Design an enzyme around this catalytic site. Structure first.
Site, PDB file in Angstrom:
ATOM      1  N   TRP A  40      12.869  -7.835  38.262  1.00 30.87           N
ATOM      2  CA  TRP A  40      13.602  -7.363  39.438  1.00 30.87           C
ATOM      3  C   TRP A  40      13.692  -5.827  39.251  1.00 30.87           C
ATOM      4  O   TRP A  40      14.377  -5.331  38.318  1.00 30.87           O
ATOM      5  CB  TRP A  40      15.002  -8.018  39.469  1.00 30.87           C
ATOM      6  N   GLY A  41      13.004  -5.089  40.124  1.00 32.11           N
ATOM      7  CA  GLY A  41      12.998  -3.626  40.041  1.00 32.11           C
ATOM      8  C   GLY A  41      14.208  -3.087  40.777  1.00 32.11           C
ATOM      9  O   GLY A  41      14.138  -2.445  41.793  1.00 32.11           O
ATOM     10  N   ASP A  54      24.565   4.034  43.246  1.00 30.28           N
ATOM     11  CA  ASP A  54      23.569   3.220  43.955  1.00 30.28           C
ATOM     12  C   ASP A  54      23.936   3.364  45.473  1.00 30.28           C
ATOM     13  O   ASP A  54      24.436   2.423  46.064  1.00 30.28           O
ATOM     14  CB  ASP A  54      23.694   1.757  43.475  1.00 30.28           C
ATOM     15  N   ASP A  81      13.092  -3.593  44.733  1.00 27.12           N
ATOM     16  CA  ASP A  81      14.218  -3.345  45.619  1.00 27.12           C
ATOM     17  C   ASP A  81      13.921  -2.069  46.476  1.00 27.12           C
ATOM     18  O   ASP A  81      13.807  -0.979  45.927  1.00 27.12           O
ATOM     19  CB  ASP A  81      15.461  -3.095  44.751  1.00 27.12           C
ATOM     20  N   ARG A 148      17.161  -9.282  52.980  1.00 31.23           N
ATOM     21  CA  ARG A 148      18.479  -9.470  52.438  1.00 31.23           C
ATOM     22  C   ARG A 148      19.534  -9.333  53.507  1.00 31.23           C
ATOM     23  O   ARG A 148      19.605  -8.323  54.228  1.00 31.23           O
ATOM     24  CB  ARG A 148      18.675  -8.489  51.283  1.00 31.23           C
TER      25      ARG A 148
HETATM   26  O1  LIG Z   1      20.148  -4.770  41.711  1.00 33.03           O
HETATM   27  C1  LIG Z   1      20.255  -4.175  42.861  1.00 33.03           C
HETATM   28  O2  LIG Z   1      19.997  -3.018  43.061  1.00 33.03           O
HETATM   29  C2  LIG Z   1      20.723  -5.066  43.972  1.00 33.03           C
HETATM   30  O3  LIG Z   1      20.216  -4.725  45.157  1.00 33.03           O
HETATM   31  C3  LIG Z   1      21.581  -6.126  43.901  1.00 33.03           C
HETATM   32  P1  LIG Z   1      23.315  -5.470  44.001  1.00 33.03           P
HETATM   33  O4  LIG Z   1      23.395  -4.829  45.415  1.00 33.03           O
HETATM   34  O5  LIG Z   1      24.162  -6.652  43.924  1.00 33.03           O
HETATM   35  O6  LIG Z   1      23.460  -4.453  42.837  1.00 33.03           O
HETATM   36 MG   LIG Z   2      19.836  -2.623  45.151  1.00 28.89          MG
END
Ligand SMILES: O=C(O)C(=O)CP(=O)(O)O
Ligand SMILES: [Mg+2]
Ligand SMILES: O=C(O)C(=O)CP(=O)(O)O
Ligand SMILES: O=C(O)C(=O)CP(=O)(O)O
Ligand SMILES: O=C(O)C(=O)CP(=O)(O)O
Ligand SMILES: O[C@@H]1[C@@H](O)[C@@H](O)OC[C@H]1O
Ligand SMILES: O[C@@H]1[C@@H](O)[C@@H](O)OC[C@H]1O
Ligand SMILES: O[C@@H]1[C@@H](O)[C@@H](O)OC[C@H]1O
Ligand SMILES: O[C@@H]1[C@@H](O)[C@@H](O)OC[C@H]1O
Ligand SMILES: [Cl-]
Ligand SMILES: [Cl-]
Ligand SMILES: [Cl-]
Ligand SMILES: [Cl-]
Ligand SMILES: [Mg+2]
Ligand SMILES: [Mg+2]
Ligand SMILES: [Mg+2]
Ligand code: NA
Ligand code: NA
Ligand code: NA
Ligand code: NA
Lengths: 283, 283, 283, 283
Positions: A40-41, A54, A81, A148
């Site tokens: 999972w990137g 983020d 992602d 998503r």
């Molecule tokens: O791992 C990430 O960057 C995701 O998109 C999942 P999260 O939004 O729950 O962090």
């Molecule tokens: Mg993300």
């Protein structure tokens, strides 16, 4: 089988596919070695490794190049992602072929509006356009486009989350990642039970860790579980502890024994392969 | 005080300065928080994180950009590893101002020949030219140029290692990093006792961890100790273990409790600062 | 004087400052040599050189690195185009210090909404937040923040264009770039005559080339004129012609004489400096 | 046919293949449109566009990413210049798959020693190792490895130049680029007449422009002619002239008419395609 075929085979097969977060190629290599189905990137993991939020702050180029580097290191599928697609459907069209060419076997794109406003999700038809642009832009039909749905998180309710999922599958999504930040799986399990679409669901159980893989296997509608950020968390936990010990001990005399050896890292770096290359070509 | 002044102050002060390896800005931030004096922008750590050998395979650009990102995250000095200068003295001249502009407070350049041949070190005068090019190319006189002497490792003996160190200091090196791969500090301690130069020495005790900081403080001639690769080693040790547990447990239900929390990573990402920015400027 | 001081001096001095587009460091060097006051790090020119539309498709990293490379080559101020700030005020806050650190002396940010929608400009208060974030994020107070008003182009009228300019100057803009795509300068000249703000205006007369520098000098309210895309246009015109001639002539026997010589390019590359470096440091 | 097949077909076909230098994707697109057979991803042109000498100063990453961008823009084969392989045979092994993955259909690697010394070429067996590493590292057998022989330029004579060419073809080179800086083609034509190898030769007639394509077609042993640096030269000639005119005229009122129009650049940027994408996916 190419990696894209492998991921498509896992999805059509009915087996539950596991993918683990990675913030660099070394961590991706360890996930492969531990036996996960894919990498999972994660945008959260890569931005965390840069010590930035983020929140679309990290450059898209930094992420795209990290995907390239990870895909050139592992033999298993990489799910990248791409946040909200870095723009509208036009950006999606230009961006998807770059992730495919970088060697990603899938992209996950969410329906949050972007950038964040001072109304939380984009219009259903606008996202349908983005997903259709992504599926139109891919070269290999086996490459996977995952939509998503943020409606549960945005507090829009279950009916709307399902309505969005169905609209996205109708636009071409190969799978629907339904997300939740609740500390129990009730909201997610109720969505799953009600999901009427034909494509498989994707879960990221980070906030509700009590939903195990055996519990998820029992949900025939889910084809993928993603461990969203456990590599960066594990890393932070250990780096922080080793640093605190070195400073308390005034050195590495104590901590050295416990650590993986330098020789072990050199092997993870592909030293073996490199010696074969030097032996057969350095003259 | 600027970071370059801070490093120069630590060197002129006589205090022993500690620098810890980091393969990304997050790890550099943890080293800062643990109390180390500076960050070591290790080529071994960054190449290991890419799962490629530390044999000049990793692109110079990847390393230079990582230095930029680390220096923009920490407030303490960054000592960047520039291997053999990525070329001859002419490349050194063009490369040094880029590392300085990236925010590094020092560079460490070794006298190994490059690329490796199918004679192990470059000629003394050639390296003197490289160090003089580095000191000529720097803009801020406080920026530090460290020459790394590989003669002990290359098996050329103590007399030659000291001869090279002195030649490099005569060419302008601000410090001499004398390296050793022995599992005991005898070779290094004998070099130190014999070192006649005026500039301070730098040790990377990775292979001889029993030489503690108290032991190094006792060597008035050493001004810097570098922990060469303990962050990537710690990371690997913990990521590998968490991955193996998740696969054995079939999930994260058990491993979750022990890990640093998602909230802890979000704080390390600068979430606080970002909320102040959103609160005062997102309108 | 630093470059930022130089640009601030030109703006406070009342002299008209000229800036020319450049899509690479070589072209920026030629603009410097031709005598322009500064370089315009045009997003249109860089995206055109990549053969992609100027619609936020080009990676921000590609542009930021090109700005770094241009600023490290010229001695005159670089005004960087940051489109709409690559996001909201939070992205602006994170992005501005990177452009400043890259060596740009100013950024130009426009009030178009982003990404484009299937309402054309962002809300006045939202843009005020973005400009205030930019001025809050800069380290050197001399670095210049230019707000670009798209209201004339968006067809919102003169009253609104002036209202926006004034709001942006109130939020901290050091200058206001009022844009127009009309083929005559009437709309721009009427805005200028009505402009009531204290900060200087910036014009990009690309679409109305008949407004000369002597005509602009007569507008005491304008402090900067930018030649928006004449370098890429000139380049295309000549490359296309030389390619067509080489293909028609079946070779370079005819075209060679007219071209600048290889020796001339080697000099523009800094060969002289490099020979001094080789002569004094390659040993 | 894939691009690699197309290049291999041109080489096996006996037709003379033309490749034109390009320093960016736009210029590569113009070369394609002018009718050249392929693009030459010139290190001289890209370093010149950065205003740095063609002496391995430019980062390898800058060149590799430019190759990616050019290959994603044109439909014809890209022959990439990898100088001396950026290191020894081990670096070659790691570097070649990156250029192949970037979409280059060939690489040209020369036998000069690297870095330059204060003996001019590497040992024949060492270069044989580098070429064998390149052919071992490629995935698609159609990808082409071209060895460039510098012996004429290094003044080692014709016998040695032919000896090296033959050794390289024996190590796996698909073609031999024999270079010369003489202002007449005598040295090159004598080498050609004596060449005994089975693989085709490659000429870069930059210094001896009087050797036309009709003259080269007459040399059945040559399969490729490369125009080494005519795009950057043409660009410089026109940019310099337009800049000088704008400064002399005090504006663009005169120069505008002659230039390609803004609309023409927008078309070269793929505006058409982008409007189709917006029309079908922006909703
Ligand atoms: O791992 C990430 O960057 C995701 O998109 C999942 P999260 O939004 O729950 O962090
Ligand atoms: Mg993300
Ligand atoms: O950390 C590094 O990259 C070093 O240069 C020290 P080492 O050569 O001992 O790994
Ligand atoms: O040169 C650019 O990128 C500009 O922003 C001015 P334009 O919008 O008129 O091209
Ligand atoms: O175009 C280049 O970069 C070349 O390698 C050919 P040259 O060495 O003749 O410039
Ligand atoms: O070469 C690869 C090896 O390194 C590992 O990842 O297992 C599968 C292979 O394809
Ligand atoms: O802003 C910095 C803070 O984040 C930390 O690193 O401590 C010192 C400061 O300069
Ligand atoms: O070094 C610079 C030179 O190259 C030129 O641009 O003119 C001004 C100087 O500062
Ligand atoms: O799509 C391409 C077009 O843009 C041009 O280059 O001609 C050939 C095509 O493959
Ligand atoms: Cl990392
Ligand atoms: Cl990284
Ligand atoms: Cl360019
Ligand atoms: Cl470029
Ligand atoms: Mg190192
Ligand atoms: Mg622009
Ligand atoms: Mg070249
Ligand atoms: Na990382
Ligand atoms: Na890393
Ligand atoms: Na360019
Ligand atoms: Na270029």
């Amino acid at each position: 089988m190419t990696k894209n075929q492998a991921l498509r085979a896992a999805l059509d097969s009915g087996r539950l596919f596991t993918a683990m977060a990675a913030h660099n190629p070394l961590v991706a290599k360890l996930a492969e070695q531990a036996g996960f189905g894919g990498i999972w990137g994660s945008g959260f993991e890569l931005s965390a490794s840069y010590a930035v939020p983020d929140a679309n702050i990290l450059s898209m180029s930094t992420h795209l190049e990290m995907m390239r580097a990870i895909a050139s290191t592992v033999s298993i599928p990489l799910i990248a992602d791409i946040d909200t697609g870095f723009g509208n459907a036009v950006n999606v069209h230009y961006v998807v072929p770059q992730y495919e060419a970088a060697g990603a076997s899938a992209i996950v794109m969410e329906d949050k509006t972007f950038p964040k406003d001072t109304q939380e999700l984009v219009r259903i038809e606008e996202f349908q356009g983005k997903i259709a642009a992504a599926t139109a832009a891919r070269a290999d039909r086996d490459f996977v486009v995952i939509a998503r749905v943020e409606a549960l998180i945005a507090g829009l309710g279950q009916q709307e989350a399902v309505r969005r999922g169905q609209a996205y599958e109708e636009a071409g999504a190969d799978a629907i990642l339904i997300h939740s930040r609740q500390k129990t799986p009730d909201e997610i399990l109720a969505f799953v039970k009600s999901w009427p679409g034909k494509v498989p669901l994707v879960l990221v159980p980070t906030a509700y860790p009590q939903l195990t893989e055996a519990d998820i296997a029992a949900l025939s509608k889910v084809g993928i579980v993603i461990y969203g950020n456990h590599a960066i968390r594990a890393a932070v936990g250990a780096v922080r502890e080793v640093f605190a010990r070195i400073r308390r001990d005034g050195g590495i005399r104590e901590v050295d024994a416990a650590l993986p050896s330098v020789k072990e890292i050199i092997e993870l770096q592909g030293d073996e392969r490199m010696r074969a290359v030097e032996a057969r070509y350095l003259k």
